[PDB]
Design a protein around this ligand. Structure first.
Ligand SMILES: CC(=O)c1cc[nH]c1
Ligand SMILES: CC(=O)c1cc[nH]c1
Ligand SMILES: CC(=O)c1cc[nH]c1
Length: 147
C-alpha cells in the first residue's frame, strides 16, 4: 500500500487524513513518495539527564529532562518545517553531538554501525526526507537523509 513504515491516521483537530511513519516518527499531510547498501545522514542531537554521556561540547553537565529535550526537538522541527530556520543552521548551533561542527553530517554508513533506532530511521528515510523525534541511548535526534 505505502512505503515502509508509513500509515494513515486521522487528525484530531481538522478531521483530515494525514500520514505518519512509525520508524522515523515523521508526520505530514501529503501522501509519501513511493534498499541501498549505504546511506548518508545528518542529525541534530538534544541530550538529556538520562543520556549515556550527559555531557557535550555545549554543556559540561547536561541537566535537562527527557521531556525538556523532546520539547526542544519539537521546537526545532517546527522552525525547520516553517522555513524560519535551516536544519544545518540549527544543527551547527544546537546539536549536542560533536558532528555539529560539520552541520550535523555523519558521512555514509551501513547497517550494523549506528545505534539501532537511528539506523532504522535513517534507512527508512528517503533521500531528502527528515525524521521526527528519534530516541536512542544518546538522546533525541532529528535525522536528515542526504544521500
Ligand atoms: C511527498 C512528501 O514526502 C512531502 C511533501 C511535503 N512534505 C512532505
Ligand atoms: C570545532 C569544534 O570543536 C566543534 C565542536 C562542536 N562544534 C564545533
Ligand atoms: C547515529 C548515532 O547512533 C549517534 C550519533 C551520536 N550519538 C549517537
Amino acid at each position: 500500500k505505502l512505503p515502509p513504515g508509513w500509515e494513515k491516521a486521522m487528525s484530531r483537530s481538522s478531521g483530515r487524513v494525514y500520514y505518519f511513519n512509525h520508524i522515523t516518527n515523521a508526520s505530514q499531510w501529503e501522501r509519501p513518495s513511493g534498499e541501498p547498501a549505504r546511506v548518508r545522514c545528518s542529525h541534530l542531537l538534544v541530550k538529556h539527564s538520562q543520556s549515556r554521556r550527559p555531557s557535550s561540547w555545549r554543556q559540561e553537565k547536561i541537566t535537562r529532562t527527557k521531556e525538556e529535550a523532546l520539547e526542544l526537538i519539537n521546537g526545532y522541527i517546527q522552525k525547520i518545517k516553517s522555513g524560519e530556520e535551516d536544519f544545518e543552521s540549527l544543527a551547527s548551533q544546537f546539536s549536542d553531538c560533536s558532528s555539529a561542527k560539520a552541520r550535523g553530517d555523519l558521512g555514509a554508513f551501513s547497517r550494523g554501525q549506528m545505534q539501532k533506532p537511528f539506523e532504522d530511521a535513517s534507512f527508512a528515510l528517503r533521500t531528502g526526507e527528515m525524521s521526527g523525534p528519534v530516541f536512542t541511548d544518546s538522546g533525541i535526534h532529528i535525522i536528515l537523509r542526504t544521500e
